[PDB]
Design a protein around this ligand. Sequence first.
Ligand SMILES: *[C@@H]1O[C@H](CO)[C@@H](O)[C@H](O)[C@H]1NC(C)=O
Lengths: 244, 109
Amino acid sequence: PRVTVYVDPPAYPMPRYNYTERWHTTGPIPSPFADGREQPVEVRYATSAAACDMLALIADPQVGRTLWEAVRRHARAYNATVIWYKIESGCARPLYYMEYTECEPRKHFGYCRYRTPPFWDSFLAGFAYPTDDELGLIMAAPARLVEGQYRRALYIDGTVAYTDFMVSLPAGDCWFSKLGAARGYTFGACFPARDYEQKKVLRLTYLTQYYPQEAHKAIVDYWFMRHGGVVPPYFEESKGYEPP
Amino acid sequence: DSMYGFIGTDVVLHCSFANPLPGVKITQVTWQKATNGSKQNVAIYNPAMGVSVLAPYRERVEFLRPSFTDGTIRLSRLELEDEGVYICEFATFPAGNRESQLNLTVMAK
Ligand SMILES: *[C@@H]1O[C@H](CO)[C@@H](O)[C@H](O)[C@H]1NC(C)=O
C-alpha cells in the first residue's frame, strides 16, 4: 500500500476472429429462478486469500460435448446465450448478457457469425471481465459488498444449465477496490421473479453494451496493475465445497 | 448541478467531454436516469453504430450535436415523472468511464 505505479498502456486488441457485431438490440432477460420441483442448481465456492487478489468464478460446463452432439446431428449451426445474475432474497440483479448466433459446432465455443457486444452491469464491469473462454468471470480486488450468490445461466443449442457461485471475501475491502459512485450506488436494481416473467427486464434498458472480452480484460488489468495488482497466469476451477 | 423546467416544456441537458486526454479512445456516450437509485438508460450514442433512444423517451429525446465528445440532448414535453438525477457517461479505453450528473426538477404551472 498505497500508491499507483506506471504500466505500459495496453493496445486496443483486435477481434480474435471475423464476425458481425449487432448493436442496440434488446430483449427480456429470462428469470434466473427455476421451479421448486427441480433438483438444486449446482453450487461452487469462490474466495480470496487476500483482499487485493483476483478471484475467478470458473466451472467447466463441458460445452465441447454439447457441440459434438450438434455435429453428430449434422446441425449446420447452433445459437448460445450467456447470462449472469446476482441472486438475493426474492430477487435477482442482471449482471451480464451475451448473445451468440449462427455458430460453428465443429469449432470451439463461440465461433459465431453474429454477436452482440456483451451487456454489463456498469459497476461489475469496472473490476470484472469474462475469462478467455467467456464462460467464467474474473473479479479484480472486489469490494466486500460483492459477496453473495452469483448464478450463471448457459443457453447452448437449446440446452440450459445453471451454476451458482458463492463468493466470500473475508479479507475485507482492498485499499483500491471500486466502491461505486454516489452515494453508495453499486449494482443495478434487484428485480422480482415476476418482473422477469412479465418481460420487463429489457437488456438495453438496464445494462450497458461494452467492450468484447479481450479489450475488457485489458482495461481491468491495466487498472489493476497500476494499483500494484499481479495478474496470475492461470486460475483454478471453483470448488464444490465450502471454504475453511 | 440543478435544472428546473415546467411541465410541457422542452429542456436541454448538457454533456461534453473536455479535455480528452491524449491516448484516450472514446467509444460512446450514454444518458441514464436514476430512481431510488436504480439506473435506466435514456439514450445511447455510439459514433460507429448510431443512436438508440429507450422507451418511454422514444420520440421525446434527441441528440443535438452528437459526437465522440458531445452527448447533449433535448428532453421534450416534460412530465412530472421526468424529475430526478440524470447521468451522462463516456465509455473510454484504456482508462474506463467518465461521468457527470445533473438534478432535474419539473415544476407545476
Ligand atoms: C438462431 O437464431 C435465429 C434468430 O436469432 C433463428 O432464426 C435461427 O433458427 C437460430 N438457429 C439455431 C440453429 O437455433
